[PDB]
Amino acid sequence: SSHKTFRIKRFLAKKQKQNRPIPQWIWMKTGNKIRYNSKRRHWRRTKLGL
Amino acid sequence: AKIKARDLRGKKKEELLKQLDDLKVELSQLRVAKVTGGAASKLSKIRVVRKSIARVLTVINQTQKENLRKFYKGKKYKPLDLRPKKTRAMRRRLNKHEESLKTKKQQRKERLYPLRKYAVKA
Amino acid sequence: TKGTSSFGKRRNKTHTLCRRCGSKAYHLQKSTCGKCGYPAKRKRKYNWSAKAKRRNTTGTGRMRHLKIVYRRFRHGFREGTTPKPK
Amino acid sequence: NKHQIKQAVKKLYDIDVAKVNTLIRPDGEKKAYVRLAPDYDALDVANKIGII
RNA sequence: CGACUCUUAGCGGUGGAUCACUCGGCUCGUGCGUCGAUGAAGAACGCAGCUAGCUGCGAGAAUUAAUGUGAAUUGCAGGUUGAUCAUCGACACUUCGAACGCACUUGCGGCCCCGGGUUCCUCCCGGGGCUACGCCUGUCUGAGCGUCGCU
RNA sequence: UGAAAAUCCGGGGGAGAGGGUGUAAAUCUCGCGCCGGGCCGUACCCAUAUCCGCAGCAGGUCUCCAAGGUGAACAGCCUCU
RNA sequence: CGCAGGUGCAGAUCUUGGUGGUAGUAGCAAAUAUUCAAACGAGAACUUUGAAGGCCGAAGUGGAGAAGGGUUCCAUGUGAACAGCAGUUGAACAUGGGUCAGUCGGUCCUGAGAGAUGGGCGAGCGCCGUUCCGAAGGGACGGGCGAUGGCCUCCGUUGCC
RNA sequence: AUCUAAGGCUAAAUACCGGCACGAGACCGAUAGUCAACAAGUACCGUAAGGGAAAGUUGAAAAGAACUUUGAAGAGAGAG
RNA sequence: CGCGACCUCAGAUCAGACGUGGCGACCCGCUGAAUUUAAGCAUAUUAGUCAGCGGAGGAAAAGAAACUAACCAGGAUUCCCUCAGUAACGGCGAGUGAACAGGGAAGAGCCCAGCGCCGAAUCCCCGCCCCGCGGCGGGGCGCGGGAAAUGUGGCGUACGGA
Ligand SMILES: [Mg+2]
Ligand SMILES: [Mg+2]
Ligand SMILES: [Mg+2]
Ligand SMILES: [Mg+2]
Ligand SMILES: [Mg+2]
Ligand SMILES: [Mg+2]
Ligand SMILES: [Mg+2]
Ligand SMILES: [Mg+2]
Ligand SMILES: [Mg+2]
Ligand SMILES: [Mg+2]
Ligand SMILES: [Mg+2]
Ligand SMILES: [Mg+2]
Ligand SMILES: [Mg+2]
Ligand SMILES: [Mg+2]
Ligand SMILES: [Mg+2]
Ligand SMILES: [Mg+2]
Ligand SMILES: [Mg+2]
Ligand SMILES: [Mg+2]
Ligand SMILES: [Mg+2]
Ligand SMILES: [Mg+2]
Ligand SMILES: [Mg+2]
Ligand SMILES: [Mg+2]
Ligand SMILES: [Mg+2]
Ligand SMILES: [Mg+2]
Ligand SMILES: [Mg+2]
Ligand SMILES: [Mg+2]
Ligand SMILES: [Mg+2]
Ligand SMILES: [Mg+2]
Ligand SMILES: [Mg+2]
Ligand SMILES: [Mg+2]
Ligand SMILES: [Mg+2]
Ligand SMILES: [Mg+2]
Ligand SMILES: [Mg+2]
Ligand SMILES: [Mg+2]
Ligand SMILES: [Mg+2]
Ligand SMILES: [Mg+2]
Ligand SMILES: [Mg+2]
Ligand SMILES: [Mg+2]
Ligand SMILES: [Mg+2]
Ligand SMILES: [Mg+2]
Ligand SMILES: [Mg+2]
Ligand SMILES: [Mg+2]
Ligand SMILES: [Mg+2]
Ligand SMILES: [Mg+2]
Ligand SMILES: [Mg+2]
Ligand SMILES: [Zn+2]
């Protein structure tokens, strides 16, 4: 599907900028209980909806 | 530099538009050095500028507006941004003169029979 | 051939994203949402599922006007005046 | 658009422009390629703005 | 003298029960009882020097003005004539949505008015303002040998 | 007995438009010269491993171009790119 | 000493977790096939180069596209996870890079059909219906008046008739 | 015997699992109590209408193990 | 065929105003079932209940008698105790089921039409000026314009009234 639309392209840009893991100081703060991002996503196991 | 809002309140209208047009250029010279790598001192200045442009767009829209609410003071028709914003049912309640109106019939049934005061013994 | 070997013939779509509810329930042929009823005027909600309201109510989002009405109320909706200038 | 860029780089950096080709990255920003007229220079305008 | 198998104890492993804590909930009760065409509820997309998330905000975007307080914020760098934290009464508030130029591809337009290539003269670009249905009192413009009669 | 419409053209008629005795008229459907054409999509897989079947599953899934030899031949057997 | 109770478990093909025997066993057998040497390397029955030997045999195990997927495409590093053995390799991980139009397409027309207004029903949110019980022309045209200004020549630009 | 239909207005005494702002409790104390004490109506399944979890605790202070050594590294051995 | 006027009726991007959708704990109007009980089951009951639909408010509705009782008579509505699980209905089976009086919380009452009299004694909007104007108002002026005799205001409503 390379005949897209723009509302779709913005939707497949947000779910692309929501994929990277945490910076290493983010679990350097004081009130941290976060060890890894648990909301990641791989394109073979799940299919995003749509 | 340190720029406050207690020295902008009576100056020229277009002087602040010029100093604004110089701070946007200066901010543009720091977006360039962010990508290409620059000093950490030339990186944290960008919060100073982004929060010292807004004190001008503020003092502008103020001194711009208290003249519109001075030119439309005594007039009966004034714009929607100016006539006072309260709630929906409070723009549509009856006004104070129309609440404090009585009839002629009641006003002549209060000339002769007011409410007296009194006290009885035991 | 009603199972596995007939799951290969699934490639087109019926539903797509709405623009009033935000969910994926905009039927294309009937042109009407299943979640919110878009070409209708009134928002579809029922009482038989008291769980499908609290997915979509007022206490959910931002309340970008109600939280500054819950603040202005306790001073009688003042306008106009200022704190004393010093 | 492709007009307001051509009218706002000539004004910022004091130069004229032959043509403009634009696209949108998958991050959602619009990259813009800008030609120049053969009377100005690219090396002589990079050193003015500091991308050198 | 061994090996396997069963039995109990000491030690060590797997496992996360018990005990002790608690910025959470449940029920009752008091006082108040406040939304939106001046554009609500909801959703979408954006914003941090190093940033993903919830959270906070809207091209002035992890907040501006004012007042009150009167010396910090902090994971790391930085640079008292009022920092930072609160209150909130002055400013601003991106796209969908009762949704409002006509559509839902974000596509096709119109009427005014300013800036520019220009030199109202057309087209040319840019900027701003208007162009939804329903109804109420008025003003304007009109139709009717079915009116209804005068001139 | 085998689709409609946008858009484009030719005739018939000649209102008079409208020209003036040439430095006329609109032409243009002849030869050149002069500026202008905005918005979005555009990489890659397209299947015995990038799709749906809980998965790198002997299944399923719409299309184009197709060499030499035997031979009736895109049949079946071998060989080049 | 008194008061109140969500107050005593072996089982319900009980509910939620957790671990054994069976067991280092069933099994890793569809479509004919692999050897020799070298290099980097801690390390090679699988990685790269070369040398042979073979298969698909033009309705292909080859070259390009649509539907769908959504960063898998490219490069450099990694080796604790995943690729049902291994792994220097990877559609895996981590950093970075990439998709340029007057002519290619969307946009523009109608088809089978969907769906508003006038109107009709209906307690009502709304429904049948699409030319049918409708005052449905907002526009050109040629001429005359009042306007303005454009180098008011030639005319624009509006109002009425 | 008792009332005047076919027309109209009117505060208090009463109700309140939603809402903002508050106090208390012979209650439960992480398989209990709301589904949810934590990035919960989130992750995730289904085309949809809708269904819907698991997950608390170092120590008073990170003072969260310098340096040596074997090992390609993981993990060790002394030390602290 | 004319200029004229009241009537009926349209159009406007005419001036100024308005409503439309959401929350839905409590509320008022309509619509409205079946499991279930009767040891079966069809009238009944389950129920004027869930679901469904439309409207509001800080509270809503009701309401100053076309009323109860037969007493030596009380005297608007709502709310609690009581009468009462009673008079009555009902394959008279299962089962449903009110009110008045009495004691108490709260206490508040009223206006129009008609009948008639005062010379439209009546409103709303535009104009100019002064005051105040973050709930758009008062007084002065308008040979300045509009609606109303198919009825605008005052007195006056069943306790009698003029
Ligand atoms: Mg798959
Ligand atoms: Mg279909
Ligand atoms: Mg509904
Ligand atoms: Mg970031
Ligand atoms: Mg301050
Ligand atoms: Mg389309
Ligand atoms: Mg001819
Ligand atoms: Mg491509
Ligand atoms: Mg047990
Ligand atoms: Mg074996
Ligand atoms: Mg073969
Ligand atoms: Mg291929
Ligand atoms: Mg290829
Ligand atoms: Mg690679
Ligand atoms: Mg085409
Ligand atoms: Mg219809
Ligand atoms: Mg009455
Ligand atoms: Mg107490
Ligand atoms: Mg207890
Ligand atoms: Mg627990
Ligand atoms: Mg729990
Ligand atoms: Mg526990
Ligand atoms: Mg736990
Ligand atoms: Mg613990
Ligand atoms: Mg208007
Ligand atoms: Mg019935
Ligand atoms: Mg029975
Ligand atoms: Mg029975
Ligand atoms: Mg039965
Ligand atoms: Mg009943
Ligand atoms: Mg019945
Ligand atoms: Mg009923
Ligand atoms: Mg109901
Ligand atoms: Mg409503
Ligand atoms: Mg309210
Ligand atoms: Mg009431
Ligand atoms: Mg009432
Ligand atoms: Mg009475
Ligand atoms: Mg009574
Ligand atoms: Mg009794
Ligand atoms: Mg019987
Ligand atoms: Mg009584
Ligand atoms: Mg009392
Ligand atoms: Mg009266
Ligand atoms: Mg009267
Ligand atoms: Zn929707």
TrEMBL record, chain A:
InterPro entries, per the entry: Ribosomal_eL39, Ribosomal_eL39_CS, Ribosomal_eL39_dom_sf
Single Gene Ontology BP annotation: translation
Entry keyword Ribosomal protein: yes
Single Gene Ontology MF annotation: structural constituent of ribosome
Keywords: Ribonucleoprotein, Ribosomal protein
Ribonucleoprotein as UniProt keyword: yes
GO cellular component, one term: cytosolic large ribosomal subunit
Family annotation (Pfam families): Ribosomal_L39 (PF00832)
Quaternary organization: Component of the large ribosomal subunit. Interacts with IMPACT.
Role this protein plays: RNA-binding component of the large ribosomal subunit. The ribosome is a large ribonucleoprotein complex responsible for the synthesis of proteins in the cell.
Family assignment from sequence similarity: Belongs to the eukaryotic ribosomal protein eL39 family.
Identification of the protein by name: Large ribosomal subunit protein eL39
